[PDB]
Symmetry: C2
Subunit: 789 residues, 2 copies
Amino acid sequence: IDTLATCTQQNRDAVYTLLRRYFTANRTLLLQSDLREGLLQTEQDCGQSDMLRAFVFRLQEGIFSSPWAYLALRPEIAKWEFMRIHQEHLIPEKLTISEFLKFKETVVKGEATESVLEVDFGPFNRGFPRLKESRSIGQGVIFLNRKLSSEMFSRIEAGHTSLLHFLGVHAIEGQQLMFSNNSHDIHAVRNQLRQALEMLETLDGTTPWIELAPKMNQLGFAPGWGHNANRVAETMNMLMDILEAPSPSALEEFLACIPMISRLLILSPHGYFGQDNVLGLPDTGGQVVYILDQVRALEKEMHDRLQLQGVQVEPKILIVTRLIPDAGDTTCNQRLEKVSGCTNTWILRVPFRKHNGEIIPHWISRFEIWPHLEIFAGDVEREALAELGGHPDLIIGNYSDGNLVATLLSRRLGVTQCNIAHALEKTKYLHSDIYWQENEDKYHFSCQYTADLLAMNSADFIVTSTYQEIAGTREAEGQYESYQAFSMPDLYRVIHGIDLFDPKFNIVSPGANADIYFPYSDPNRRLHSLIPEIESLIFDDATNLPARGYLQDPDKPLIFTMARLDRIKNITGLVELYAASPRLRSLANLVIVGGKIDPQHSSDHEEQEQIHRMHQLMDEHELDQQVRWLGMRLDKNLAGELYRYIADKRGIFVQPALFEAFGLTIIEAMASGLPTFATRYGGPLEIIQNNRSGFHIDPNQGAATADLIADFFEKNLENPQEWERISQGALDRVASRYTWKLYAERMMTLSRIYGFWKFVSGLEREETDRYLNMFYHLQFRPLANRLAH
Amino acid sequence: IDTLATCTQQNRDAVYTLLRRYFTANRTLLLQSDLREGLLQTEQDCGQSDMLRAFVFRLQEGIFSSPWAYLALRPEIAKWEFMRIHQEHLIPEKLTISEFLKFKETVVKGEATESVLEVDFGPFNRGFPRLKESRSIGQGVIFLNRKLSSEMFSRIEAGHTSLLHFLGVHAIEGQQLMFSNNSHDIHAVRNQLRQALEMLETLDGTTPWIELAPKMNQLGFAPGWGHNANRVAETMNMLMDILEAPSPSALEEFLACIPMISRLLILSPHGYFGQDNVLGLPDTGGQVVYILDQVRALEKEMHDRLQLQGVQVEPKILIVTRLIPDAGDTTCNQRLEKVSGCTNTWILRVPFRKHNGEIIPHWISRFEIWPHLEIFAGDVEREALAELGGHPDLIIGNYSDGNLVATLLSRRLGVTQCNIAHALEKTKYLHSDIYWQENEDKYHFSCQYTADLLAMNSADFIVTSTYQEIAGTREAEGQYESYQAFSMPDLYRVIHGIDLFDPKFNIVSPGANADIYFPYSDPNRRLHSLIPEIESLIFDDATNLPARGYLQDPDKPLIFTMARLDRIKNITGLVELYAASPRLRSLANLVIVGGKIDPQHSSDHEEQEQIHRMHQLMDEHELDQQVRWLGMRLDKNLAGELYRYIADKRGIFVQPALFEAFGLTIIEAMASGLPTFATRYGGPLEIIQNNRSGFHIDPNQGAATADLIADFFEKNLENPQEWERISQGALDRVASRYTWKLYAERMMTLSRIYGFWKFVSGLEREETDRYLNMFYHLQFRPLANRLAH
């Protein structure tokens, strides 16, 4: 399906009529909904044309002026074509991306007095490796291993490649690691390894390193091969194997164990960061929870890896954020703050300053933050360098501000850089680029988008929680995808902004918290002592903390859900699709948690209409004695035991939100063991595999969805066996895919592999560096200096 | 010789005193002369140290504040080292250019607020072929032919060659050239060449192309292989050789003959251009003369090459400059003016406009011309494309403005770009880079030097008139060299500004004209109408015409000078050294043409104060009747015969300038057969082979100069015999190097060979292009919108 496919000139009046329908100038820029809408009638006059339907449904946008229509097609994930067609004589003509963007720029902001600067990464990226198939997008590291090992295999030469050198350039706290001297060769190294392996063969496996150490030093080995002798033999045999005939599995496993990761530096400069005073501050969401739940697992794995290799040194993680004097109550005024559940992890707060600074007291929003970032980055470099012994081994950027500071610092210190955007707004606010001048005052998107572009191009690897975050779906463009080509009129045009097939992209999903949410079938950890309390809240009555509706009749199964009550999550729509279809009304009861239940005056916020719609929907249908509505926000421990309590007896969790980005709570539920019916739109699509790990449901189809629920409830004498099929499938799904432990081993390996790639590919990328740096200085710097005006 | 040559701690007392003598802080920035001064007193204290003299004489500059001295050392041509010495405990420390330039920055303008932008062309040029020996600089085309053929060999050994495709892509005036089919296939072309050749064997030499064309066309061949069968044979044989085994000479000979070039665009937007009338106007000069005496030669050559290949089209040359609606007494408001002496060569004039423009009527100085140039370039592009049939084949820029325009124009059109700076002022004005802030109001160097860097990097080849214009001397850095690294405070820093060993640099030296300056010995062509007028200029006297000589020495040898009366042309030095030496006084008589003088102003103030010293030195030492003097300006056709007259009756020319970049005067003198005594300082060093083509004199020692001249006058019978040897020496040196015919042959080849190098090397250069385009948009554009306020 392409420009050739408008050969739909077989029915010419159809195409002509369609273009006419579009051309009526209401909006000259149409998105999908409009573009598709116009298909139906034409769809009467004249004909049907499944081909034409295919085409139109693949249109991302169009720009109509004059007798000219400029189309952007997206036939398959991450592939775009551009064309323009003449209203009267209808000949599809292929366009370059520059041509199409020039047209959009003209139609929107008018003919130009000066030539636009086109930022183009194409020349810079030409020649570096790319994934080929789009199903593969999001596992870079695999591809990268195969490329690295394939390339490395021509060590039939002086090899190999630089692995022998690379092995020598890491030292932990001044102590040289893996090799006493860098002799290179590889005939030498092969021999030393051979001798060492020989000696080892004659010692007991359990000989500790401190015995091996001096005679290993003679053979040219510094420490870090292992703790005992078995592990030394394992590691060295790995290297022997790679030096003989390198392979991707072997090279990954060996790289993964090099004791090079000691010091982490994580950037999150926006918001009020802090511990547990969170949940609802300005610019603070589960933003905090990702980082906090991660660093615990991270620190553990760091320690385990180093331990196994016999390096005794204690790892350190610094979460750097802003020191705000003006907190006054929350910890945000506190420079060093130790993190819970962690030995050497510390929050390090740093002040914003003026050029003379001058500590700059009050909180600043993320949209205003840009002018402070370079100064902040200098300051952070100083303080973080001082709190660690020296350079960090890895720098992890968070959101757009964190990624930018990561960029600056990482170029300054020469450190492997990982970016985590968590989200990129350019796609969520459609047309915020072409219309950027509209939004500069509130949103400040010129600064933020430029920062974005700079950073996704500067990173060594890029972590994302979902595939969709990167390349989207067949339907929707993905978040990074949005940056491949775009226009900022009066600023610049970007083409080749990001290569979705670059190996830098890795999906590493979060998971857990496994101390709170875990399976109902766990022998040890369940909190039995809250179970009486759980049953109070559910099956008993009245109002003391918000309620009510007193099911009684509870021999029946249970349908459970919990969320912030508001419109994305669509609780109201759940209670609603439960209202009609008396089949599942009679088949099961319904529990709801999260809510307010009488907003009062004074205070609340936002929706509150969700409350009115809830009480209203519950008054109608006679929903009490069926549905228990609880308006507490609960508690971690409590929530966890509750999920587990819904399993036994064989209950289910249903969240029909409209769209969920990642969907943490789906994971929490699944981790609990209970079968989950989740949104079809966003993360849950990837998280649950339908009728193995759980079930997909359409929110807007809830009428029909209600009858999927009842069907699961029937299923072999009131659903004993299949419920357990889904339960175990869910458990297995979480265990195999979404857990902070896997996350952390993956992350710890990635830093190693990508540090090596950086080590090899480093020189070749220097032109890219100069280009990014010239952009930062001559484009970003002024944009952030236009703030503060 | 180098950094370790400050091992002079062998005598470190002298070193300490040299540093202390430097640190006296009369200046922070110490240049060459003031560095050499510091070695003489301290001289009589303490010691001598030849090693130290070597080291000091190789310093280009040093930067002093604090205990610390920073040194820039230039050991040999185009090779630099940088170091720092501590005043108290003195040990040398090797510095990178970046380090040295940073300190230069943070001293003169003081500590930086934010990080400087370092424009770095290094990663971009990495990989491109470059010369090795400094004595080879400016020879570029030769090196390039060697790389071209060297690479063509290995490519032709594998499947393909770009030579064939490149042969395909030039169709002069709509008709296909060299090849009928588009065949990319080398075996095929070998076959066709074979047949074609064998078929030419059967016809005889002079068969005109018109006859061969259809038989040739059955064979796959379009025209342009020759005018008759002889020549077609010749060039098809060249291609056959090349396709078998490439070699540099054959390759250059074949490239040299391709009918690629029918259209020149020569750019000179500043000054008042015009045919004649222009000497003395603002921004104008002999600047125009280069262009005007070049283009006849050029036009002729271009036509010839085309004729020989049997292509009949009429070539066009456009000299494009500014339309100034203010006549200002001139022809400068005329849009299209035919250059006289040429068949198709035209000055096309184009107005400057404002952003609504709105033609700007008034003269604008070169120093202020920056903001108009992009607008100008667009306008030139349109008008010129119209006036030529289409794209020009080569674009030549002149000066800084011309070169920036050519940069813009050539990137838009995809045309080979030649740059002629004629001079680059960064070395002319001391510290005008580091101090650029001072000089902005007058000079606007922030714009100039930026455009300079841009253009030097953009051009496909750079023509200069001498070696030193590029790389200078053992003492002097060159005009281009100075852009290699420099700082421009509050704008940027450059390193790797230009590579002097890049093959793009070619010395192509002009001369003559040649209807005017020609050998005194010619069978024809001489002007005898002038011959009585001549004698009466030297020999008559007093009040009947400009004064005051009265020689009266009939057969006495002549010593001729003709110049401006100003300080650096230095006529004062010549007359002074003439009076000072009695033997020289006895051997010849000194004739002088220049100044207006005649009375001191009226007219022509105020620098003609040199008339003071003129009369002051003429009356005392009792000059008259020894030395004639004319205040005339000498209409050129006359002066030509004046040179022709000063030989037989024999005489000499003397150009005792203090410094002379090229010395066109000298070229003219030698062209006329005069033995020439020319200044050692500047291009005359290159032009005259001493004691073959002429003699070099140090205008500083008058004793030795006049002595040398005398010694020349005393040879044999009084020089029958060695005046003639040098005279023929000059004649031959002029026909073998400086002639516009030679210039034209070389230009017309350079455009073909660099056209092919662009063709072949362009895709690899794309990252360099994007970098330069970003630099332009984000750096130049702003600097020139500052003007323009």
